[PDB]
Design a binder for this molecule. Structure first.
Ligand SMILES: [Cl-]
Ligand SMILES: [Cl-]
Ligand SMILES: [Cl-]
Ligand SMILES: [Cl-]
Lengths: 220, 220
């Protein structure tokens, strides 16, 4: 090992925040961890240095000053769409090559104890006509951490993703990104999360309660 | 036949609007159609007559004046949660009985050409500890219409649901509820929907383009 893919149930989940918190925690525990964003849409790197890859780069440069954006993010598009569409429209002669990405990402396992790879869009978002984000995670042989939002509706979103993930050959965890000012989660949604977890071999966790558990998972 | 379950990808999809439009269309074509909402959460019937079941009732009373709310909706809770939680908290001695619901819903096939049954929450939302909305749809032997929202993100949500639905033994269609003022769908999300549909035996449709197709589907 070790490599951990991070995806989200939905665009509003806050996966980048969670990825940064987990890598900060791992680093602080002496587990040397890098954050990669191999594919990113909706960017404009001449004008905005606040993309996921830029935030990752900032964190990463605390371990290696020589890193640059192109070392950690490889396919970057202005369009907000799914990567497949953004690619076809902006770079028609350059399909996303997941073999190349697998080599680039796995090279970092020489120099890091943990390589965190953040996806874009969700598990089912297309990268090529043949491959989605989940297919890429499967090719990488990574473990998966799927971040959920904390709003009403999270049960359906978590369980949709759980069904997809349990139906494929990978080790995964679903973690809810619970915000500090959320006055409803515990009384509205948590009761079912607790019931679900009694009946499941793989429980849904709360991210904020689970830094040690998720580091253990990632490094297992 | 005929019975058509209606669910949604997410809370923001507008399934009730779509259900009402489809039943209006069917009625206008001489296909006598009733709208049922067997389970509803987040209601307060003393104070608000604008719940899904109330809207359904209004439409239904154009065919049968004698119908009342209790004829078309059977388990109603104040809590916004998943039905299982709302039930456990409000009516601990009265679990939702899907055998009873199956009998009640199927009785309407005596008097209607099409029975539309709207769920609550989504396919994976729990009704009992053992059954979710999809399990209930499967017990009913209904066809399924799953309404999607039309925002960025719809690809992942549609495909998550498609995976769940294709993995079970039922006839389904996914339809996007496209709003009139949406200035982004066609250039951002539709290109992939079109690609997907070339490669699928069961295409994702746009609800507004598909009243005749969906009526044909429901009555097939
Ligand atoms: Cl994020
Ligand atoms: Cl929920
Ligand atoms: Cl609705
Ligand atoms: Cl989309």
């Amino acid at each position: 090992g070790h490599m951990l893919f991070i995806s989200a149930t939905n665009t509003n989940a806050g996966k980048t925040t969670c990825a940064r918190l987990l890598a900060q925690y791992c680093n602080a525990c002496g587990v040397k961890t890098i954050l990669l964003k191999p594919i990113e849409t909706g960017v404009n790197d001449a004008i905005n240095h606040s993309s996921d890859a830029h935030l990752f780069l900032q964190d990463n440069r605390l371990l290696d000053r020589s890193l640059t954006l192109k070392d950690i993010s490889f396919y970057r598009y202005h369009k907000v769409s799914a990567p497949l569409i953004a690619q076809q429209e902006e770079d028609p002669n350059a399909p996303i090559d997941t073999d190349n990405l697998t080599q680039r990402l796995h090279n970092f396992t020489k120099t890091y104890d943990l390589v965190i790879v953040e996806g874009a869009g969700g598990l089912c978002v297309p990268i090529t006509l043949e491959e989605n984000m989940l297919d890429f995670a499967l090719k990488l042989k990574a473990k998966m951490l799927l971040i959920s939002h904390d709003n009403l509706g999270l049960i359906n979103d978590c369980l949709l993703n759980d069904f997809l993930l349990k139906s494929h050959q990978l080790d995964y965890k679903i973690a809810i990104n619970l915000k500090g000012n959320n006055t409803a989660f515990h009384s509205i949604s948590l009761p079912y999360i607790e019931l679900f977890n009694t009946r499941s071999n793989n429980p849904i966790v709360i991210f904020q309660q689970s830094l040690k558990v998720l580091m253990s998972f990632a490094l297992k």
